[PDB]
Amino acid sequence: IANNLTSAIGELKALNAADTPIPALAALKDVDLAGLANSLATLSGGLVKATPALNAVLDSLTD
Amino acid sequence: SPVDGIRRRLDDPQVAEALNSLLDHADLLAVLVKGLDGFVRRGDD
Amino acid sequence: ASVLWFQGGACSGNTMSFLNADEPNVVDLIVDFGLDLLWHPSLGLELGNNAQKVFWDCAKGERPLDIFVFEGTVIEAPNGTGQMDMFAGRPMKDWVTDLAGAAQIVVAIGDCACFGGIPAMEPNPSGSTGLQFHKREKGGFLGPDFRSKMGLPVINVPGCPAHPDWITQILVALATGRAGDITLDDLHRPETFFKTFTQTGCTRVQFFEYKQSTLSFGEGTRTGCLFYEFGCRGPMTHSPCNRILWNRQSSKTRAGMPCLGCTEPEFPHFDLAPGTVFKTQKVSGMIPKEVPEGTDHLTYMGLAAAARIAAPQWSKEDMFVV
C-alpha cells in the first residue's frame, strides 16, 4: 500500500502549465477602494454603454 | 447457566472458528495495544 | 595506579580487544600512563606462587590496588561454591570478593563481567553472573550496594567484547586526573561512550530513516538498514560503535552485520532462541516487535509509512558500492 501511495504521489509529481511567481499585494488601503468602487458603480452603466465609442477610439490607436 | 451458556458458545463451531482466528492474530492485537500504551506513556513527549 | 586484571568466566575477548588499543596502545597505556599492571592472566609474567603472592598482597591490603579489572563472569556453580572457576587456589568468586573489596575502583569489562553475558544464558551451567548486575537486574555478585573505595559502583564497560577505547580512555581519564569527568549511566556504563546508540554514526541510518531494508547478506548489504530483516538492535543499543569504530576500521552495522545489542545487559537478547538470530521479530509480519528506543509502535509505524512514501531513489539503491 505504501508502494501504491508512492507511485500515486510520484505521478502527481509530474506537473505542467502552472506559473506562481513572487505574488505580492499592499497599499490598497491607501487607495480609496470604497470610494473608487462607488465611483466605478456610478461609471459602470456609462462604461458599458460607451463600449462602442471606446472601441472606435481604440481602433484608431491600433493603426 | 450463564457461564455454562458461554462455555456452550466455546464449543459452537462458527464461534470457535472466529475465536481461534482472534487467537491467530492475537500478536497484532497485543502489539497495537502495546503501541497505544507506548503512545500514552509518551503522550507528554 | 596499580591495576589487577582478573578473568573469571571469560573468553579473554575483552583482553584481546584491549590489546587492539590505539591512542593509547596497550603498551603505552601500561608503561607511559602510570598504570602499573600488577598482573593479568594473559600478560602477567608471574606464575604459580609468585602470582598468588601478588594476588594475596592485593586482597589483604599489603599493597594498594587502585583498579581491579574483572573480565568474564563471576562463576558461582556448582551449588554456589564457584568451583567451576578455580583460580590460584580459590574459587574465582572469592578472589572477586576480596579484590573488589580492596580496589579503589572496580571495572567490569565485557558483558560477562558487567551483566553475566553469554555464560549467563540459560541454562547458565556455570552459575555465571556479573559483578554488580545479572542481566538488567542490578546486584549481580557484589550486590546492588557495593561501592569501591573511591565510592564508585562497579564501572561497567560492556560489550562482548568491549571496544579497547571503552576501557583505555577510561583508564587514561583516571590516569590524567579526569576521573571526575567520568559519568556513569544507570547500568554504570561510561556515558561518554554509552549515551549514543550503535545506530549513532551507522552508515545505514539514512536507509533506516527512509525504512529501506537490507534484504540479504553479502552484496545485499551494499544498501539498506539491517533493522527490519536482520534484527539490528542498533537503535535500541547504547554504544559508540559507529562513533568510535572497531579496530579503527568499521563496525558490525557498517559491515552489514546487525548489532546484537551486546552493550545492553540482556545480551544475548532473547537468549538466541530459535528464530531470533539475525532476524527481526515482527508482529503480523510487518510491525517490529521492538521499535527504536524512546519510540512507540504507533508513532514509529506512522513515521515509517510516511518515510517509505517519501523515500528518495538513492535510498533504494546500492550505496556501499565497490
Ligand code: F3S
Ligand atoms: S568478549 Fe568474552 S569475556 Fe565475556 S564479554 Fe564477551 S564472552
Ligand code: F3S
Ligand atoms: S541504521 Fe545501522 S545500527 Fe542497525 S538499525 Fe540500521 S543497520
Ligand code: F3S
Ligand atoms: S553487538 Fe555490540 S560491539 Fe557494538 S555494534 Fe552492537 S553494541
